[PDB]
Ligand binder design. Structure first.
Ligand SMILES: CN(C)C(=N)NC(=N)N
Length: 454
């Protein structure tokens, strides 16, 4: 199979390290497509806006349809996510993974370049929809590819280090937003590492599991000897692409074969969609809990962006031995019991508000780090379609429902949204962390996992 030859080969070799840096340079490009609107949505105030830079609000005249503008903008981005979920979930299974990712990166690069010189607001909306759709496809495909590519005992290292790469992408976005004469300079500076990825994407291999599922043993042997020659060692071909006698046709029934696995997979994928929805809603509620500003213009966003590194390092230290479901329970209970304190009286002589908000964030970031890792480890039949469906098709619902509901609630009553978010999160997502599946150090992706699971 793949795990035995991966253990017999260098799982963390130097070629693996340069491929890791290349897909990390992919990972830092996912910051502004999801969170960079805060650096593009400055609203300082015949309408005159006093700011040395500019924004979309300064560019247009958003004084009577300002609420109709940005809400529809982010709703169209999340609709682009909604199309892109099913789109890449079937397209990666159809035309493979690596060529899909390369073409999708090229489309992202040309779409960002054309976004930098957007003529009209209709072009703005269309390009934002296409950008969101493509960028979500790129990031999820890259994360799945490198989760599969690394060996058995080093999945978490890769996953947590790429969440760290996303964090340093937000940090570099905050550092870049200091030099903001127009949004165009920011977008043009962001779009250049995508071309760097395209330039240095000629020396990256495919996914051995998906390639082996195509019964192409020759190119599997080719990529194994390429990996061995890159590390400069003779490969101990114990299996020699044995393929475990796999002959099942790829994409036989994506999400249609779950009827035979109803008592064993339906409840698991349901609780996974529940946990994704809870993470998205709680995350957005904690961002809007101050409305992305608290006495500052950039320091609040840095506090909401540099908080991920302590959570990531805590996860990397913690989840090696205790498992991957107890971290879910600890993170969920900590987030709930941290956000529940804001109902109490504000700190008269201390900083309890920022303390509970930062520890709640830490809990939510530990939860989001894991949700992706356990999703990649699970859905053993085909990790692409089902994994994207649980990842993105129940996060776009959070993106379309969560800001409108909490905005209207904070317009009418502060107490209801925080209480409902805390109750739903704490109770339901702590019940959700009650072993959806048995955890194993190995990472196979065959249907034998679905029918056995140890
Ligand atoms: C990257 N995007 C869109 C997030 N909202 N991240 C998140 N922690 N839910």
């Amino acid at each position: 199979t793949v795990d035995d030859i991966l253990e017999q080969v260098g799982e963390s070799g130097w070629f693996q390290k340069q491929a890791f840096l290349i897909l990390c340079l992919l990972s830092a490009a996912f910051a502004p497509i999801c969170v960079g609107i805060v650096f593009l949505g400055f609203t300082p105030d015949g309408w005159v806006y006093d700011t040395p830079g500019s924004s979309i609000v300064t560019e247009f005249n958003l004084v009577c349809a300002d609420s109709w503008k940005l809400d529809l903008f982010q709703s169209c981005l999340n609709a682009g996510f909604l199309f892109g979920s099913l789109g890449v979930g079937y397209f990666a299974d159809r035309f493979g993974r690596k060529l899909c990712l390369l073409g999708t990166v090229l489309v992202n690069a040309v779409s960002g370049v054309l976004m930098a010189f957007s003529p009209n607001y209709m072009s703005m909306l269309l390009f934002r929809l296409l950008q969101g759709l493509v960028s979500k496809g790129n990031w999820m495909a890259g994360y799945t590819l490198i989760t599969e590519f690394v060996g058995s005992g080093s999945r978490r290292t890769v996953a947590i280090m790429y969440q760290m790469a996303f964090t340093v992408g937000l940090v570099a976005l905050t550092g870049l937003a200091y030099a903001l004469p127009h949004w165009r300079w920011l977008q043009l500076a962001v779009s250049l590492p995508t071309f760097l990825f395209l330039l240095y994407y000629w020396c990256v291999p495919e996914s051995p599991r998906w390639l082996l599922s195509q019964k192409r043993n020759t190119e599997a042997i080719k990529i194994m000897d390429h990996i061995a020659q890159k590390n400069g060692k003779l490969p101990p071909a114990d299996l020699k692409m044995l393929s475990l006698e796999e002959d099942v046709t790829e994409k036989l029934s994506p999400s249609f074969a779950d009827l035979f696995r109803t008592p064993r997979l339906r409840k698991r994928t349901f609780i996974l969609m529940y946990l994704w929805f809870t993470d998205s809603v709680l995350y957005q509620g904690l961002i809007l809990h101050m409305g992305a500003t608290s006495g500052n213009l950039y320091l609040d966003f840095l506090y909401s962006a540099l908080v991920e590194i302590p959570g990531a390092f805590i996860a990397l230290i913690t989840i090696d031995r205790v498992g991957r479901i107890y971290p879910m329970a600890m993170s969920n209970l900590l987030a709930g019991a941290a956000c529940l304190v804001m109902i109490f009286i504000s700190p008269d002589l201390h900083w309890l508000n920022i303390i509970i908000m930062c520890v709640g964030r830490m809990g939510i970031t530990i939860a989001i780090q894991m949700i992706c890792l356990v999703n990649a480890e699970l859905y053993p039949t085909f990790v692409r379609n089902l994994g994207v469906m649980v990842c993105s098709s129940l996060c776009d619902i959070g993106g379309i429902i969560t800001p409108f509901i909490v905005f209207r609630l904070r317009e009418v009553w502060q107490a209801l949204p925080l209480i409902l978010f805390a109750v739903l999160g704490l109770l339901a997502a702590g019940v959700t962390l009650l072993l959806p599946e048995t955890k194993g150090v190995a990472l196979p992706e065959t249907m034998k996992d679905a029918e056995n699971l140890g």
